[PDB]
Amino acid sequence: LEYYFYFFKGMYEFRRKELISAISAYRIAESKLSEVEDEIEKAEFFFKVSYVYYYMKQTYFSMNYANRALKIFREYEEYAVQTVRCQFIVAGNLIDSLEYERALEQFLKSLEISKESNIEHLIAMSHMNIGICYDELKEYKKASQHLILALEIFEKSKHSFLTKTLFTLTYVEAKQQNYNVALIYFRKGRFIADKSDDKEYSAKFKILEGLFFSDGETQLIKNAFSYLASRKMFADVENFSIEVADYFHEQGNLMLSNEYYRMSIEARRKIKKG
Ligand SMILES: [Cl-]
């Protein structure tokens, strides 16, 4: 009963996003976990802990607590959902460490389990995340095939991940210079983003637009970064500005390319500063 209180309190503080309090409460719940019964109430506990750690990008701690929950959840065949989610945490942490090959292995396992258990949304989530790793690994053909499979499911369900999947799909096709097919996913995603009031992807589509689908309207890229930066989305600013910087480097536009490397530096500094 005592562990339960500290446990619930941790989830409670995480809800109001008091991260220090949550982990603080979890730290004692874990001590009073000495008197724990079922292997899966522990697993439930470890999962939550890995999650708050994943939120604070404490990559080492998150992946530790995730694996401990995972190694238990795998057995109990009634807990496929929990198993898949644990694997997402592991793979998300691996993504944060730029271990995209290892993260792909995780997500591939997730897809198998999501399949043999017919969890439709987890199937699309695996496909999407697989496609994202592939994009990072620059295997764009496979990235696209996994992304449309995700798209088929999300379009039916109208889940929020629809926008992000269309965005990633658009970008992947643009990187292969498949500008005509990309423009189709661009208009479709840009529309879904606008009508869902997804201001974040609206700004992100504007970056693709300035990059690929206007006549070189670079101010669109700029204004979109202004929007993102104003929203304190510095990870997005850091990652996207590097992609933009790389692209201009490949074109031989060194001045523009430098401007965006500089911006990524600043965004990184803002992340360390909190
Ligand atoms: Cl094309």
Residue numbers in the entry: 101 to 374
From the paper:
The large family of Gram-positive quorum-sensing receptors known as the RNPP proteins consists of receptors homologous to the Rap, NprR, PlcR, and PrgX proteins that are regulated by imported oligopeptide autoinducers. Rap proteins and their inhibitory oligopeptides, called Phr peptides, have been most extensively studied in B. subtilis, which encodes 11 Rap proteins on its chromosome and another five on plasmids.
While discussed extensively below, it is worthwhile to note here that there are two copies of RapI in the crystallographic asymmetric unit, and while one model is relatively complete, there was in fact insufficient electron density to build helix-turn-helix (HTH) 1 and HTH2 in the second model (see Discussion and Materials and Methods). Similarly, comparing the structure of RapI with the structures of RapH-Spo0F and RapF-ComAC revealed that the RapI 3-helix bundle and linker region have joined the TPR domain; however, it is important to note that RapI and RapJ are not in identical conformations. Therefore, we evaluated the ability of RapI to dephosphorylate Spo0F in vitro, and we found that RapI is indeed a Spo0F phosphatase. Furthermore, we determined that the pentapeptide DRVGA and hexapeptide ADRVGA, sequences derived from the pro-PhrI C-terminus, inhibit RapI phosphatase activity in vitro. In the more complete RapI model, where the N-terminal 3-helix bundle and linker region are included, the N-terminal 3-helix bundle, linker region, and C-terminal TPR domain together bury 857 Å2 surface area at their interface.
